[PDB]
């Protein structure tokens, strides 16, 4: 007897401990609050302060931030961050994402106070971009 | 007569997240993250038969209670709200029966030993289908 | 008697693939992957009722084929295996009511329309709710 | 001002960013390596081997040879170069380089065992996962 044969799986040992080496559990878990999940948003604008609670089934996320000085937050996939958020325009921030680890797509993200009385989100990874529109409750 | 046929290239897609959240597929996601890609560690405060059971992981921190013979509430394994139903098989093993709050699915159950050794022992069942986990006092 | 308070550290976690097999866990990981996080390019041959559309992203090219008016089995968005009836609303518009062949959860469908602007329109419902993708000749 | 409470009425193209993000690569992965459980076909016909991996969701095949470089992927789907080496007369070893980007070192190994098992071995910076099989 050498390898061949039609081999039955008797004993999988430890693969959550791998997943975990891997990231795959914080893909999970962003992955079904960012593209499961139906948001709701909460902004408070203090000045150039802004507090954003997106509130979902699964999870309820709370950022912090004053344009012009850096925070940490997540990628939309879950990955830690270094967030700068500018004003583009009078109405329109835009935030520049650095990796705290490992390699990836280039992201950022948009938020717009449009004329039209809607906020708008993009999310860019190498210049394909997610959007998001919401209106007043 | 209309001829859909085409090499077809997409411009949109809009409202999936709604589909998938009408779906449950955020909660099953979630409790993926948590049981199966996550690397927990347990915390237990018995006194009697009540229990407190806080499973920590990178991705959530869950805590339950519950006290054996009392019917309570908690989640299976992929997020689905169950009733569930603790009763001692033995002094040191209690066996926990679960029947859905909604829908159908595989007959679900978990088991909490102590082991002469002072092992814990959580067993885990789906239908025929086993899984141990299998831990130590830190 | 047993005491089972502690911190406790796992060891071992034995078989847990098995039960997220019994559980469906694998047939929605595989769908949303296709679904949820793939851009799509869809082929389609039309010859009278009979559909042939083969769907290619990174991850899988999958080819499934109907007949309007005769049922037949695919998997709802989520990955569940259902039965299907596809009947024409219009010459430009096919709907199609799906009921899961195990199991309970919202009631779905789907639509596929060419418009006269040459786009083919994919919805797809779960109970009230409605995703809907767009898509244009190469 | 931003400040509200403020409702979602459009989501557009999250697949196109999820693609990618490799988003797909690693669900589609582990809907076959983590959720489901596996069949092995081996054909051993000297040092060249035919690997089939059957679940409900996915077959995959690789073919490889002692000592030759081939492409499969990591755990996690991504494509690497692999090297398999004999450890032992009884043991073989793989390391794995990424095509593309930055990981976890990664290895597998594949022991016939002298009890009639076949034990699988994976790794990601020291981490193990055991896969033990018997014959059918
Ligand atoms: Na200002
Ligand atoms: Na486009
Ligand atoms: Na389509
Ligand atoms: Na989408």
Avoid: H
């Amino acid at each position: 007897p050498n390898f061949s044969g039609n081999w039955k799986i008797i004993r999988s040992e430890n693969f959550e401990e791998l997943l975990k080496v891997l990231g795959v559990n914080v893909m999970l878990a962003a992955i079904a609050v960012a593209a499961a999940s139906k948001p709701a948003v909460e902004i408070k604008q203090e000045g150039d302060t802004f507090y954003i609670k997106t509130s979902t089934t699964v999870r309820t996320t709370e950022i912090n931030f004053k344009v012009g000085e850096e925070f940490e937050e997540q990628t939309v996939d879950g990955r830690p961050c270094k967030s700068l958020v500018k004003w583009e325009s009078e109405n329109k921030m835009v935030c520049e994402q650095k990796l705290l680890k490992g390699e990836g797509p280039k992201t950022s993200w948009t938020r717009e106070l449009t004329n039209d009385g809607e906020l708008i989100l993009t999310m860019t990874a190498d210049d394909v971009v997610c959007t998001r529109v919401y209106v007043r409750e």
